[PDB]
């Protein structure tokens, strides 16, 4: 997760995966110019740092 | 909007993000 509505309390986890709205204009649940999905993936390499 | 850090100056709008609103046809 990279975006959230607010901060997270200690020992609290969240499962819901919806597009995180940041600059209004709801994106009808897809990636948007203002609102952005907080759930992304890592890229791992065998020869990275 | 129902929550904010402080009061809003006149003729100032904010786009940063908020709760949805419900309408009924047979309401008051």
From Swiss-Prot, chain A:
It comes from Severe acute respiratory syndrome coronavirus 2 (2019-nCoV). Changing residue 37 to L: Increased resistance to neutralizing antibodies and human covalescent sera neutralization. Changing residue 45 to R: In strain: Omicron/BA.1, Omicron/BA.2, Omicron/BA.2.12.1, Omicron/BA.2.75, Omicron/BA.4, Omicron/BA.5, Omicron/BQ.1.1, Omicron/XBB.1.5, Omicron/EG.5.1. Changing residue 24 to N: In strain: 20A.EU2, Iota/B.1.526, Omicron/BA.1, Omicron/BA.2, Omicron/BA.2.12.1, Omicron/BA.2.75, Omicron/BA.4, Omicron/BA.5, Omicron/BQ.1.1, Omicron/XBB.1.5, Omicron/EG.5.1. Binds to host ACE2. RBD also interacts with the N-linked glycan on 'Asn-90' of ACE2. Cleavage of S generates a polybasic C-terminal sequence on S1 that binds to host Neuropilin-1 (NRP1) and Neuropilin-2 (NRP2) receptors. Interacts with host integrin alpha-5/beta-1 (ITGA5:ITGB1) and with ACE2 in complex with integrin alpha-5/beta-1 (ITGA5:ITGB1). May interact via cytoplasmic c-terminus with M protein. May interact (via N-terminus) with host bilirubin and biliverdin, thereby preventing antibody binding to the SARS-CoV-2 spike NTD via an allosteric mechanism. Residues 1-49 are annotated as: Receptor-binding motif. Changing residue 22 to V: Increased resistance to neutralizing antibodies. Changing residue 40 to N: Reduced host ACE2-binding affinity in vitro. Attaches the virion to the cell membrane by interacting with host receptor, initiating the infection. The major receptor is host ACE2. When S2/S2' has been cleaved, binding to the receptor triggers direct fusion at the cell membrane. When S2/S2' has not been cleaved, binding to the receptor results in internalization of the virus by endocytosis using host TFRC and GRM2 and leading to fusion of the virion membrane with the host endosomal membrane. Alternatively, may use NRP1/NRP2 and integrin as entry receptors. Changing residue 7 to K: In strain: Omicron/BA.2.75, Omicron/BQ.1.1, Omicron/XBB.1.5, Omicron/EG.5.1. Residues 2-37 are annotated as: Disordered. Changing residue 48 to Y: In strain: Alpha/B.1.1.7, Beta/B.1.351, Gamma/P.1, Theta/P.3, Mu/B.1.621, 19B/501Y, Omicron/BA.1, Omicron/BA.2, Omicron/BA.2.12.1, Omicron/BA.2.75, Omicron/BA.4, Omicron/BA.5, Omicron/BQ.1.1, Omicron/XBB.1.5, Omicron/EG.5.1; May enhance affinity to human ACE2 receptor. This is Spike protein S1.
